[PDB]
Design a protein around this nucleic acid. Sequence first.
DNA 1: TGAGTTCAAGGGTCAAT
DNA 2: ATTGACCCTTGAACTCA
Lengths: 82, 81
Amino acid sequence: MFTKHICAICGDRSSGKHYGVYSCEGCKGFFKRTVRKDLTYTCRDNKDCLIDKRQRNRCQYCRYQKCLAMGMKREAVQEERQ
Amino acid sequence: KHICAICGDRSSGKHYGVYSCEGCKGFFKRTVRKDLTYTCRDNKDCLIDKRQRNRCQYCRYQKCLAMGMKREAVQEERQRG
DNA sequence: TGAGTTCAAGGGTCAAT
DNA sequence: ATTGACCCTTGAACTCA
Ligand SMILES: [Cl-]
Ligand SMILES: [Cl-]
Ligand SMILES: [Cl-]
Ligand SMILES: [Cl-]
Ligand SMILES: [Mg+2]
Ligand SMILES: [Mg+2]
Ligand SMILES: [Mg+2]
Ligand SMILES: [Mg+2]
Ligand SMILES: [Mg+2]
Ligand SMILES: [Mg+2]
Ligand SMILES: [Mg+2]
Ligand SMILES: [Zn+2]
Ligand SMILES: [Zn+2]
Ligand SMILES: [Zn+2]
Ligand SMILES: [Zn+2]
């Protein structure tokens, strides 16, 4: 299940790739929501916040940049289903 | 549709492992986040119900713990907004 | 495997105190 | 300062091809 994979973004356990990157269900859901709602975030610190399991929700801006930096593809996010 | 296990007020679901109201939830969260220590004015046996719950923070906290609330379920503070 | 989904239980806000 | 009614986000667990 979540045996041989680690989230490239936050280090949490991973069941496989999502949007092109080995990632956890947290980072997958976060990236999907960000892309679908076309959200913009702001870092109130130095735009280099630590992204690990405990801290990944502290700064949405930095979490999102890391999703991109590790390879997440926005084009892989499909349209909501009606 | 439950009742808060701490003060007997009306519950909005489980919070930090226990059925509890928005009051007791926010109280526990704040206590844990700021790592506050309270002191009881009397015998550490203060009644904790809907109307008295704010009269002794020490006793309110000890009842939170005694009913099962988990410090570890309180997360790191998130950014302002 | 990797798209999709849901909603309980995390979060924050801010008028009232 | 703290409280709590009210609203927003997260992510474990599930379906579908
Ligand atoms: Cl990867
Ligand atoms: Cl005190
Ligand atoms: Cl008090
Ligand atoms: Cl959460
Ligand atoms: Mg996790
Ligand atoms: Mg996968
Ligand atoms: Mg996760
Ligand atoms: Mg990328
Ligand atoms: Mg909760
Ligand atoms: Mg409270
Ligand atoms: Mg949201
Ligand atoms: Zn992750
Ligand atoms: Zn940041
Ligand atoms: Zn309560
Ligand atoms: Zn007391």
